[PDB]
Enzyme design. Structure first.
Site, PDB file in Angstrom:
ATOM      1  N   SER A  23       9.545 -14.463  -4.028  1.00  0.00           N
ATOM      2  CA  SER A  23       8.644 -13.512  -3.387  1.00  0.00           C
ATOM      3  C   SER A  23       8.164 -14.071  -2.042  1.00  0.00           C
ATOM      4  O   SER A  23       8.841 -14.941  -1.469  1.00  0.00           O
ATOM      5  CB  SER A  23       7.519 -13.163  -4.316  1.00  0.00           C
ATOM      6  N   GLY A  24       6.987 -13.647  -1.563  1.00  0.00           N
ATOM      7  CA  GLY A  24       6.579 -14.044  -0.186  1.00  0.00           C
ATOM      8  C   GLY A  24       7.321 -13.160   0.831  1.00  0.00           C
ATOM      9  O   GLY A  24       7.434 -13.496   2.006  1.00  0.00           O
ATOM     10  N   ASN A  25       7.797 -11.994   0.391  1.00  0.00           N
ATOM     11  CA  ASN A  25       8.288 -10.999   1.352  1.00  0.00           C
ATOM     12  C   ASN A  25       8.206  -9.556   0.827  1.00  0.00           C
ATOM     13  O   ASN A  25       7.861  -9.369  -0.338  1.00  0.00           O
ATOM     14  CB  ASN A  25       9.679 -11.364   1.868  1.00  0.00           C
ATOM     15  N   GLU A  55       0.849  -1.220   0.000  1.00  0.00           N
ATOM     16  CA  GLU A  55       0.000   0.000   0.000  1.00  0.00           C
ATOM     17  C   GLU A  55       0.876   1.259   0.000  1.00  0.00           C
ATOM     18  O   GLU A  55       0.584   2.237  -0.703  1.00  0.00           O
ATOM     19  CB  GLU A  55      -0.945   0.016   1.237  1.00  0.00           C
ATOM     20  N   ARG A  90      18.416  -9.203  -0.344  1.00  0.00           N
ATOM     21  CA  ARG A  90      18.156  -9.600   1.036  1.00  0.00           C
ATOM     22  C   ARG A  90      19.311 -10.540   1.439  1.00  0.00           C
ATOM     23  O   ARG A  90      19.964 -11.139   0.577  1.00  0.00           O
ATOM     24  CB  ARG A  90      16.808 -10.354   1.105  1.00  0.00           C
ATOM     25  N   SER A 108      11.742 -19.686 -32.924  1.00  0.00           N
ATOM     26  CA  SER A 108      13.161 -19.346 -32.847  1.00  0.00           C
ATOM     27  C   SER A 108      13.506 -18.493 -31.630  1.00  0.00           C
ATOM     28  O   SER A 108      12.775 -17.536 -31.335  1.00  0.00           O
ATOM     29  CB  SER A 108      13.614 -18.565 -34.092  1.00  0.00           C
ATOM     30  N   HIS A 149       6.091 -19.667  12.601  1.00  0.00           N
ATOM     31  CA  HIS A 149       4.644 -19.278  12.729  1.00  0.00           C
ATOM     32  C   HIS A 149       3.834 -20.013  13.826  1.00  0.00           C
ATOM     33  O   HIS A 149       2.589 -20.020  13.791  1.00  0.00           O
ATOM     34  CB  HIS A 149       3.875 -19.446  11.372  1.00  0.00           C
ATOM     35  N   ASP A 162      22.224   7.667 -13.068  1.00  0.00           N
ATOM     36  CA  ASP A 162      20.838   7.488 -13.502  1.00  0.00           C
ATOM     37  C   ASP A 162      20.724   6.274 -14.415  1.00  0.00           C
ATOM     38  O   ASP A 162      19.792   5.507 -14.294  1.00  0.00           O
ATOM     39  CB  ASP A 162      20.286   8.750 -14.207  1.00  0.00           C
ATOM     40  N   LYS A 204       4.966 -19.136  -4.916  1.00  0.00           N
ATOM     41  CA  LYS A 204       5.278 -17.736  -4.738  1.00  0.00           C
ATOM     42  C   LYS A 204       6.664 -17.504  -4.124  1.00  0.00           C
ATOM     43  O   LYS A 204       7.283 -16.488  -4.367  1.00  0.00           O
ATOM     44  CB  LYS A 204       4.224 -17.130  -3.767  1.00  0.00           C
TER      45      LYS A 204
HETATM   46  N1  LIG Z   1      10.804 -22.516   7.712  1.00  0.00           N
HETATM   47  C1  LIG Z   1       9.564 -22.330   6.926  1.00  0.00           C
HETATM   48  C2  LIG Z   1       9.770 -21.221   5.821  1.00  0.00           C
HETATM   49  C3  LIG Z   1      10.323 -19.858   6.311  1.00  0.00           C
HETATM   50  C4  LIG Z   1      10.369 -18.888   5.072  1.00  0.00           C
HETATM   51  O1  LIG Z   1      10.986 -19.223   4.063  1.00  0.00           O
HETATM   52  N2  LIG Z   1       9.678 -17.746   5.134  1.00  0.00           N
HETATM   53  C5  LIG Z   1       9.554 -16.784   3.963  1.00  0.00           C
HETATM   54  C6  LIG Z   1       8.240 -16.035   4.104  1.00  0.00           C
HETATM   55  O2  LIG Z   1       8.362 -15.122   5.170  1.00  0.00           O
HETATM   56  P1  LIG Z   1       7.056 -14.569   5.841  1.00  0.00           P
HETATM   57  O3  LIG Z   1       6.395 -15.634   6.667  1.00  0.00           O
HETATM   58  O4  LIG Z   1       7.433 -13.289   6.609  1.00  0.00           O
HETATM   59  N3  LIG Z   1       6.030 -14.166   4.642  1.00  0.00           N
HETATM   60  C7  LIG Z   1       4.591 -14.523   4.827  1.00  0.00           C
HETATM   61  C8  LIG Z   1       3.608 -13.720   3.837  1.00  0.00           C
HETATM   62  C9  LIG Z   1       4.027 -13.946   2.370  1.00  0.00           C
HETATM   63  C10 LIG Z   1       2.970 -13.458   1.344  1.00  0.00           C
HETATM   64  O5  LIG Z   1       1.771 -13.264   1.731  1.00  0.00           O
HETATM   65  O6  LIG Z   1       3.397 -13.236   0.174  1.00  0.00           O
HETATM   66  C11 LIG Z   1       4.317 -16.012   4.587  1.00  0.00           C
HETATM   67  O7  LIG Z   1       5.089 -16.656   3.838  1.00  0.00           O
HETATM   68  O8  LIG Z   1       3.270 -16.495   5.128  1.00  0.00           O
HETATM   69  C12 LIG Z   1      10.718 -15.745   4.001  1.00  0.00           C
HETATM   70  O9  LIG Z   1      11.446 -15.718   5.007  1.00  0.00           O
HETATM   71  O10 LIG Z   1      10.797 -14.963   3.056  1.00  0.00           O
HETATM   72  C13 LIG Z   1       9.046 -23.671   6.288  1.00  0.00           C
HETATM   73  O11 LIG Z   1       9.905 -24.497   5.927  1.00  0.00           O
HETATM   74  O12 LIG Z   1       7.823 -23.837   6.093  1.00  0.00           O
HETATM   75 CA   LIG Z   2      -4.072  -1.014  -2.598  1.00  0.00          CA
HETATM   76 CL   LIG Z   3      14.782 -10.920   4.383  1.00  0.00          CL
HETATM   77 ZN   LIG Z   4       8.340 -12.377   7.984  1.00  0.00          ZN
HETATM   78 ZN   LIG Z   5       5.978 -15.097   8.513  1.00  0.00          ZN
END
Ligand SMILES: N[C@@H](CCC(=O)N[C@@H](COP(=O)(O)N[C@@H](CCC(=O)O)C(=O)O)C(=O)O)C(=O)O
Ligand SMILES: [Ca+2]
Ligand SMILES: [Cl-]
Ligand SMILES: [Zn+2]
Ligand SMILES: [Zn+2]
Ligand SMILES: *[C@@H]1O[C@H](CO)[C@@H](O[C@@H]2O[C@H](CO)[C@@H](O[C@@H]3O[C@H](CO)[C@@H](O)[C@H](O[C@H]4O[C@H](CO)[C@@H](O)[C@H](O)[C@@H]4O)[C@@H]3O)[C@H](O)[C@H]2NC(C)=O)[C@H](O)[C@H]1NC(C)=O
Ligand SMILES: *[C@@H]1O[C@H](CO)[C@@H](O[C@@H]2O[C@H](CO)[C@@H](O[C@@H]3O[C@H](CO)[C@@H](O)[C@H](O[C@H]4O[C@H](CO)[C@@H](O)[C@H](O)[C@@H]4O)[C@@H]3O)[C@H](O)[C@H]2NC(C)=O)[C@H](O)[C@H]1NC(C)=O
Ligand SMILES: *[C@@H]1O[C@H](CO)[C@@H](O[C@@H]2O[C@H](CO)[C@@H](O[C@@H]3O[C@H](CO)[C@@H](O)[C@H](O)[C@@H]3O)[C@H](O)[C@H]2NC(C)=O)[C@H](O)[C@H]1NC(C)=O
Ligand SMILES: *[C@@H]1O[C@H](CO)[C@@H](O[C@@H]2O[C@H](CO)[C@@H](O[C@@H]3O[C@H](CO)[C@@H](O)[C@H](O)[C@@H]3O)[C@H](O)[C@H]2NC(C)=O)[C@H](O)[C@H]1NC(C)=O
Ligand SMILES: N[C@@H](CCC(=O)N[C@@H](COP(=O)(O)N[C@@H](CCC(=O)O)C(=O)O)C(=O)O)C(=O)O
Ligand SMILES: *[C@@H]1O[C@H](CO)[C@@H](O[C@@H]2O[C@H](CO)[C@@H](O)[C@H](O)[C@H]2NC(C)=O)[C@H](O)[C@H]1NC(C)=O
Ligand SMILES: *[C@@H]1O[C@H](CO)[C@@H](O[C@@H]2O[C@H](CO)[C@@H](O)[C@H](O)[C@H]2NC(C)=O)[C@H](O)[C@H]1NC(C)=O
Ligand SMILES: *[C@@H]1O[C@H](CO)[C@@H](O[C@@H]2O[C@H](CO)[C@@H](O)[C@H](O)[C@H]2NC(C)=O)[C@H](O)[C@H]1NC(C)=O
Ligand SMILES: *[C@@H]1O[C@H](CO)[C@@H](O[C@@H]2O[C@H](CO)[C@@H](O)[C@H](O)[C@H]2NC(C)=O)[C@H](O)[C@H]1NC(C)=O
Ligand SMILES: *[C@@H]1O[C@H](CO)[C@@H](O[C@@H]2O[C@H](CO)[C@@H](O)[C@H](O)[C@H]2NC(C)=O)[C@H](O)[C@H]1NC(C)=O
Ligand SMILES: *[C@@H]1O[C@H](CO)[C@@H](O[C@@H]2O[C@H](CO)[C@@H](O)[C@H](O)[C@H]2NC(C)=O)[C@H](O)[C@H]1NC(C)=O
Ligand SMILES: *[C@@H]1O[C@H](CO)[C@@H](O)[C@H](O)[C@H]1NC(C)=O
Ligand SMILES: *[C@@H]1O[C@H](CO)[C@@H](O)[C@H](O)[C@H]1NC(C)=O
Ligand SMILES: *[C@@H]1O[C@H](CO)[C@@H](O)[C@H](O)[C@H]1NC(C)=O
Ligand SMILES: *[C@@H]1O[C@H](CO)[C@@H](O)[C@H](O)[C@H]1NC(C)=O
Ligand SMILES: [Ca+2]
Ligand SMILES: [Cl-]
Ligand SMILES: [Zn+2]
Ligand SMILES: [Zn+2]
EC number: 3.4.17.21
Lengths: 694, 694
Positions: B463-465, B379, B480, B574, B499, B610, B643
């Site tokens: 992704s997922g972060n 956001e 990262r 190709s 979690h 730039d 993801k």
């Molecule tokens: N040890 C865990 C995985 C830990 C992991 O890889 N976490 C991800 C995801 O981190 P996160 O939990 O803060 N991200 C959330 C939200 C991600 C999203 O909504 O895109 C999630 O994956 O639930 C990272 O460190 O980037 C396992 O094996 O399941």
């Molecule tokens: Ca939005």
């Molecule tokens: Cl990170």
């Molecule tokens: Zn996290």
């Molecule tokens: Zn998390």
């Protein structure tokens, strides 16, 4: 000294004249050998003139041409299928050109093939409101009918879209003398009026900014993947053909059915202007039959791209561009503009040879295939979009330098209002009775601003020309200027010979600008604007002028919504956020202007020039407008009803348009509110680009 | 001296420890008062620390919570409808926390409500290939079935999408000891393994980069127009709930139908891992019933945004960001990262108080609602996209600093490979047996690059972060780093307590990093990267590293296509244009590097900075990837199947994926060719941003 005055004094009316003559002796239709030869000529001369680099940039785009051996025409056909009247196969060529080859006969570019037969319905200008009047008020159904419409008022592509959506099976476009024959002036060659045999060529696409129909998003280069024709952007689904008023008369004179609803539907021909459908009594079994055999073909086009490298900021681009392709000789459209560009390049080059360079880079462009849908400029911008997005300061268009001989006409972003006012105060008026007076004085006298005393009218940008991709898609501050007619006398064409074989060098030289002084004035305005954009230490944009117009446009869209007070109450439709954003923009712009006046520090300057440059850019929404992904500017888009006109807050305007007819008012008003949110957000986000950066 | 060494020496392990303890004593769930209080604390301390400005930026976004008085659970239900077994209502809290309030019970965020009953089918990890194996090879139909799947291998959102598309009517997620219980380590509190009662919380959305489900494109501010829930982005259509392995065992032990297809389908529980559907013989009339009553609610979230204004280029932003919200205590995720950010800010602030400022502006961010779909960062980026697009140099993420204690892990754009290699050669290894050796040496020894001897592995971004909006949507160079496990031993979790309520300060302090030396090393890598990005005169990006990887990814996607030689011949597929573009990129990048080495001129420098900054930006396609408009980077996207993983040339990869199953090969191969064109064009366009500008 090398200053704007040295640039301006070097421009000569006599050079513009020589160049116009040079560019208009043969047709230069897009995709033909002769237009490739002219491209190569312009390239050579621009190099001669002193530009650092001059290249052709070519693309393979969808074009459209009549079939040389299977001519397009329209008939009235009787019960037996005898064709008892045929429209003309060509315009009678003008004196001295009766032996010129390769004059394309009149046609509507991109018409599908077909030979539909049916009953005629006359639809006035084929505007949205003309179809509302037919279908809603008169109860006339266009479905399965051939529609005949007069040119004028709106882009002919919109007419065709409207006719298609009404269910027409074909469209006939004609030039009515009401719109194309000024009282008391003679027909070409004896005056500047359209003769009964003259016909307006022109494309009938609805591209919505896509560029080449086959490659939306990406340049049409050598390895491009192309859509199949059935998925192409913007092609009409019914045959279309244009005719002159001698032929139109023969088609309209027999018209029966309903009387025209009022006098705004009657042209000047000696016919009743009955709406139809079909012919009166004795001729009720006669039909109209179209014969269209044009073909769409992927064809090579060539832009000329000239570069004059900046001395201090070579990575900032000020672009002067206009097209080179014409329907036939292009005496006005585009060569009156291209001859001006040529002289501008020559002048800048003279300074360059003496050791001068502009501060920023200047790019000069001779666009191809503009007449087939802005294809050349749009493909080149798609190719170069990342460079333009991050480096493009301004785009100045340079199509037709004249469409009249009365006063100046400028359409541009508000960011250039102040530049335009200041420059025109420093130029001499070319007008009879204003000798020794400034262009600003004569212009302001002849074309007063509706809002402010002692200011001239400057209009918003519409579209239907090559600035479209730079301004509405990419968000680069854009402007254009030309000499124009007196729009107060009447709103009819100041050049009725538009897109006809009669639009020649002689037309210009004899009837518009025999001394080439209007052309010279326009070269000084366009050239001067480019000079200042490319050389001023601080970019010559005044963000405060945007704040003033944003409030105007917010008042306007609010007043449109306020015609529906009950629904605004029911659905809680508020413009508060939009006005709040406009207020914030005004306050922030005012603070920015103070800092801009108040800061030896080149990083502050360049930081400040970047804030100036990226301000127009901030009005771009990367999701685009609903169902028009290439119109991304949230303040300005081409009108959905008329590509030539600009519309302000287009997203809100289109959500409100004809809203009382929507079957689900809750949904329609939801969408109004969504567009209000998008607009308020974008205005606030643009404002915030002018805040202190950290 | 104020140099990187002064910055780095000021960072203390003991401070990181104190901050981690401080941030993990109570839960900080997004949208709760306690997480608002922590935001206000961080804001105050960042000001104390010396930042120029520290603000909260708040948004009202869709979140999801269990119903406190109507708990979620799963039953085995008999013919009479007696619930004969119930899953747990909460995880047994760890020692000393048995009186802590407001621990959210395990749930899948954004599950719809429902109480579906049915027969179980076990689907392994619920990956694309697991469903292929069930449906195509085993002929097992998931339609109308409740699917049970083990966590691991892929993002749980993808599992749920896959189950939905298989026609499941509900999903049960569980943690198998095969994946979450390392051999020879004890369960929490006596070791770092997941106990049988532990449960992994987590959202199950498929947002594809949209951010808040209700406001895709625009920030969720005070006047935002929201979609209705039925049009929200990314919500699952079937109920989902997570359980531990004690409960999973009770659900799986009765499973009948088909044997598992092979040993890759068997976890470590004492059950057959039968795929089903339904239970064996005697229990064939028993069913599984879910009871989900969670609610989605628009809730206020708060990012903390800290600014340290640049001395020379205040309009260039280097961003260090990581989230602050946690499922429960967030001992690792995210507070091990947030404590590191806090110490980094403290250090930069100590230098600032002594008169130093970085060359460019540094922005520090404490993101909220990351766990509910990256909502806070997304956001804020939607709100500020124009500033970020034109001013954003780099984004460094700062979630979990450790997921193991073995070696470094870095994922970043190729533009940062050289920066990362150089920095890690200047840092001390924290590893036992590498004392007096560099971090580069220990890392390279433990995690060798697959392609090059004597280099370490650096992965692409998945992704997922919170880097997702900056990198995949906006095109800002991103990276990262964290400490990680030995991925060579096995590919199982290095933190099984992920979690769960057991993920606490004590977990970290006792079992991962008692001396906080791994945390300190990670603070030096993240902090050092930010220091160099914000202070180096020339941006520390090497465009030549992109050229090397582009060729790797082109070889790779070509080799995938080459599994289908007949179709490549038939449809004239190709890769020539893609390789040509990659060759050009390599040549142009090499020339640019020479100029970068070879130019006192600040405009050349800034022009060159730039070009460096906008290079990542050039890989953005404003039309986005097919049906994923917020994934706009053409080289990198999150895998459509997972993801968390990055995919290279995603547009081509997805066009080729499972292509032999498409019913219209002509159309499918057309789309492969279209994606090849888009990729070749984008690579060439990116290359051209590095050419001389005029
Ligand atoms: N040890 C865990 C995985 C830990 C992991 O890889 N976490 C991800 C995801 O981190 P996160 O939990 O803060 N991200 C959330 C939200 C991600 C999203 O909504 O895109 C999630 O994956 O639930 C990272 O460190 O980037 C396992 O094996 O399941
Ligand atoms: Ca939005
Ligand atoms: Cl990170
Ligand atoms: Zn996290
Ligand atoms: Zn998390
Ligand atoms: C134009 O610029 C001005 C800045 O001068 C800017 O004003 C901002 O308006 C927003 C939106 O109205 C204000 O938002 C408030 O912020 C406070 C925290 O600072 C919150 O407590 C408020 O929420 C409460 O009240 C709401 C409204 O009744 C309730 O709906 C809500 O549930 C809470 O109870 C609220 O979010 C913001 O503080 C000011 N910022 C200032 C004064 O600095 C304005 O938004 C700009 N216009 C546009 C279109 O952006
Ligand atoms: C990588 O960079 C190189 C530049 O070093 C760039 O090479 C360019 O390739 C294009 C596309 O192949 C060349 O295009 C040709 O241009 C000439 C005019 O200069 C035309 O006459 C050619 O068209 C004829 O031949 C075609 C191919 O057989 C026919 O299909 C066509 O109908 C014509 O008969 C053709 O368009 C271009 O000249 C070079 N530019 C150079 C060498 O400067 C290459 O494209 C870059 N790779 C990518 C992916 O962009
Ligand atoms: C068009 O021309 C007008 C009139 O010349 C330009 O406005 C003028 O711009 C100058 C230069 O910035 C302003 O001068 C400043 O005055 C203040 C003191 O009041 C001082 O702080 C600065 O150091 C500087 O001298 C001048 O006030 C201003 N005049 C106005 C607004 O009436 C305008 O900028 C030109 N537009 C362009 C170039 O786009
Ligand atoms: C990571 O570290 C390496 C090794 O220090 C950096 O590469 C080195 O960068 C310097 C500075 O540009 C190069 O020096 C140059 O040498 C040439 C003469 O060969 C000369 O033209 C210049 O005036 C300058 O002295 C040096 O060659 C180069 N060494 C290499 C490539 O082996 C690299 O830049 C660092 N990466 C970063 C900062 O991202
Ligand atoms: N006198 C004429 C109108 C002359 C005019 O306004 N021309 C437009 C359009 O110029 P153009 O002819 O070069 N543009 C083409 C192509 C526009 C498009 O495809 O978007 C067209 O309108 O057919 C302009 O000068 O911008 C008349 O009244 O019909
Ligand atoms: C338009 O002007 C150009 C430029 O002067 C003319 O093209 C030149 O023609 C001469 C004589 O035929 C040649 O020797 C030159 O090589 C041409 N120069 C270039 C740059 O092309 C052209 O003939 C003129 N066209 C018309 C119709 O008058
Ligand atoms: C334009 O029209 C011509 C002439 O009518 C077309 O040529 C005919 O095409 C058919 C087969 O398609 C032949 O059997 C005829 O003998 C051709 N007639 C003549 C007189 O040549 C031609 O196809 C059209 N051209 C284009 C580009 O469509
Ligand atoms: C209008 O044009 C058509 C087509 O050329 C003319 O009709 C043709 O006349 C020839 C010669 O008499 C016939 O052999 C063709 O079969 C006709 N073609 C068609 C399509 O009907 C027609 O005579 C012309 N009408 C007028 C009034 O000039
Ligand atoms: C985490 O650390 C902060 C900062 O030291 C503590 O918050 C302070 O608490 C003291 C004593 O209650 C107050 O007088 C201060 O006003 C607080 N400062 C700020 C900036 O909020 C907080 O108590 C610590 N939390 C835990 C759980 O130990
Ligand atoms: C959570 O569940 C509770 C408790 O079962 C719901 O409260 C009931 O709602 C109905 C009407 O919707 C009332 O007639 C009942 O008396 C309520 N029961 C109790 C025990 O309070 C509540 O709706 C749910 N909360 C949310 C946010 O959905
Ligand atoms: C699992 O939970 C359910 C719900 O609490 C239990 O079934 C309830 O038992 C009470 C008290 O005996 C009944 O009055 C309710 O009507 C039952 N509810 C439902 C939905 O059936 C059930 O006993 C529990 N099962 C076990 C083995 O603990
Ligand atoms: C118009 O004409 C056709 C009949 O041929 C019909 O199908 C169509 O619905 C009509 N529309 C109206 C509004 O009468
Ligand atoms: C040129 O100007 C004169 C004087 O107003 C006018 O009568 C004439 O119509 C103009 N020519 C054109 C083509 O507009
Ligand atoms: C799976 O199950 C349902 C029957 O309830 C059926 O409608 C669906 O088409 C089936 N699919 C396959 C591939 O057998
Ligand atoms: C910490 O390192 C030791 C030594 O390799 C290892 O045995 C232990 O499992 C590690 N702790 C964690 C949580 O990985
Ligand atoms: Ca295109
Ligand atoms: Cl123009
Ligand atoms: Zn034209
Ligand atoms: Zn034109």
């Amino acid at each position: 000294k090398h200053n704007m005055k040295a640039f301006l004094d070097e421009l000569k009316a006599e050079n513009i004249k020589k160049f116009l003559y040079n560019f208009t002796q043969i047709p230069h239709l897009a995709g033909t050998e002769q237009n490739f030869q002219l491209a190569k000529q312009i390239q050579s001369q621009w190099k001669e003139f002193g530009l650092d680099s001059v290249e052709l940039a070519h693309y393979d785009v969808l074009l459209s041409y009549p079939n040389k051996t299977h001519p397009n025409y329209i008939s009235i056909i009787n019960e037996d299928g005898n064709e008892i009247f045929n429209t003309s196969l060509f315009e009678p060529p003008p004196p001295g050109y009766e032996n010129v080859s390769d004059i394309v006969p009149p046609f509507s570019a991109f018409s599908p093939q077909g030979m539909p037969e049916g009953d005629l319905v006359y639809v006035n200008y084929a505007r949205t409101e003309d179809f509302f009047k037919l279908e809603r008020d008169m109860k006339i159904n266009c479905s399965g009918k051939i529609v005949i419409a007069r040119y004028g008022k709106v882009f002919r592509g919109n007419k065709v879209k409207n006719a298609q959506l009404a269910g027409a099976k074909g469209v006939i476009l004609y030039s009515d003398p009401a719109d194309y024959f000024a009282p008391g002036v003679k027909s070409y060659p004896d005056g500047w009026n359209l003769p009964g045999g003259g016909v307006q060529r022109g494309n009938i696409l609805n591209l919505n900014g896509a560029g080449d129909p086959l490659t939306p998003g990406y340049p049409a280069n050598e390895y491009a993947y192309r859509r199949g024709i059935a998925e192409a952007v913007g092609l009409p689904s019914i045959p279309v053909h244009p005719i002159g008023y001698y032929d139109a008369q023969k088609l309209l004179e027999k018209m029966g059915g309903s009387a025209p609803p009022d006098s705004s539907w009657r042209g000047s021909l000696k016919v009743p202007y009955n709406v139809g459908p079909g012919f009166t009594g004795n001729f009720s079994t006669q039909k109209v039959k179209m014969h269209i055999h044009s073909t769409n073909e992927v064809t090579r086009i060539y832009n000329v791209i000239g570069t004059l490298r900046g001395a201090v900021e070579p990575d900032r681009y000020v672009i002067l561009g206009g097209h080179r392709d014409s329907w036939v000789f292009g005496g006005i459209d585009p060569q009156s503009g291209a001859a001006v560009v040529h002289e501008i390049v020559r002048s800048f080059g003279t300074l360059k040879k003496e050791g001068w360079r502009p501060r920023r880079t200047i790019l000069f462009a001779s666009w191809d295939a503009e007449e087939f849908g802005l294809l050349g400029s749009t493909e080149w911008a798609e190719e170069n979009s990342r460079l333009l997005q991050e480096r493009g300061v301004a785009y100045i268009n340079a199509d037709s330098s004249i469409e009249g001989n009365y006063t100046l006409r400028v359409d541009c972003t508000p960011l250039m209002y102040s530049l335009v006012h200041n420059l025109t105060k420093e130029l001499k008026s070319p007008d009879e009775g204003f000798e020794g007076k400034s262009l600003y004085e004569s212009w302001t006298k002849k074309s007063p601003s509706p809002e402010f005393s002692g200011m001239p009218r400057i209009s918003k940008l519409g579209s239907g020309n090559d600035f479209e991709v730079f301004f509405q898609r990419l968000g680069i501050a854009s402007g254009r200027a030309r000499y124009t007619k007196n729009w107060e006398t009447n709103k009819f064409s100041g050049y009725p010979l538009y897109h006809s074989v009669y639009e020649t060098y002689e037309l210009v030289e004899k009837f518009y600008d025999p001394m080439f002084k209007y052309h010279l004035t326009v070269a000084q305005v366009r050239g001067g604007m480019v000079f200042e954009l490319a050389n001023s230490i601080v970019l010559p944009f005044d963000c405060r002028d945007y704040a003033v117009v944003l409030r105007k446009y917010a008042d306007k869209i609010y007043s449109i919504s306020m015609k529906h007070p009950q629904e605004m109450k029911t659905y809680s439709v508020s413009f508060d956020s939009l006005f709040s954003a406009v207020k914030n923009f005004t306050e922030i712009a005012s603070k920015f202007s103070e800092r801009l006046q108040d800061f030896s520090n080149p990083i502050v300057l360049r930081m400040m020039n970047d804030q100036l440059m990226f301000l127009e850019r901030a009005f771009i929404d990367p999701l685009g407008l609903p169902d028009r992904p290439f119109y991304r500017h949230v303040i300005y888009a081409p009108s959905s009803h008329n590509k030539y006109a600009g519309e302000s807050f287009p997203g809100i305007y289109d959500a409100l348009f004809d809203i009382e007819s929507k079957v689900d008012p809750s949904k329609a008003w939801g969408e109004v509110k969504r567009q209000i949110y998008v607009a308020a957000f974008t205005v606030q986000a643009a404002a915030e680009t002018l805040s202190e950066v950290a």
